């Protein structure tokens, strides 16, 4: 019930950051990153922000489990699963990329 607060705060921060990036791109401040065009660098920054947010949420979720938890036991044993699966189940799924 506290991990939910942390996750919600992180998601809101990520949303605010991406909105700020969009505002900067609209008002012509985000300069093109070397080797990429304006749209390419805009997309790269957005993707990096979302991935950082997802990783932060997953780490917060992982650190909030208990030794008696079964997902964590099966992941540390490596029998079937991974940390990203626990992250998607509890914290947040993430970006649904295609191609």
């Amino acid at each position: 019930s506290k991990t939910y607060q942390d996750i919600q705060n992180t998601i809101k921060k990520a949303k605010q950051d991406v909105i700020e990036v969009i505002e900067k791109a609209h008002n012509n401040e985000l300069e093109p990153t070397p080797g990429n065009t304006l749209r390419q660098t805009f997309e790269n920054q957005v993707n990096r922000i979302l991935n950082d947010a997802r990783d932060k949420t997953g780490s917060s979720a992982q650190k909030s489990l208990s030794e008696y938890n079964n997902f964590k036991s099966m992941v540390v044993s490596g029998a079937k699963g991974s940390k990203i699966n626990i992250s998607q189940v509890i914290a947040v799924v993430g970006q649904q990329n295609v191609e």
């Binding site: 540390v76 044993s77 490596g78």
Partner: protein, 49 residues
């Protein structure tokens, strides 16, 4: 079986443990150590089995 000897690390083995003290006596029960085919330390996982 037999007298096997091998060393393996557990999945949840903190990297900042070998450098500091408590190298041969791990609080988290990691750093699998088998001598003469007898488990001594560590928790078995996919890394060892």
């Amino acid at each position: 079986p037999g007298h096997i000897n091998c060393i393996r690390t557990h999945s949840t083995h903190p990297d900042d443990e070998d450098s500091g003290p408590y190298k041969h006596i791990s609080p988290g029960d990691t750093k699998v150590v088998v001598e003469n085919g007898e488990l001594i330390m560590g928790i078995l996982c996919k890394k060892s089995l």
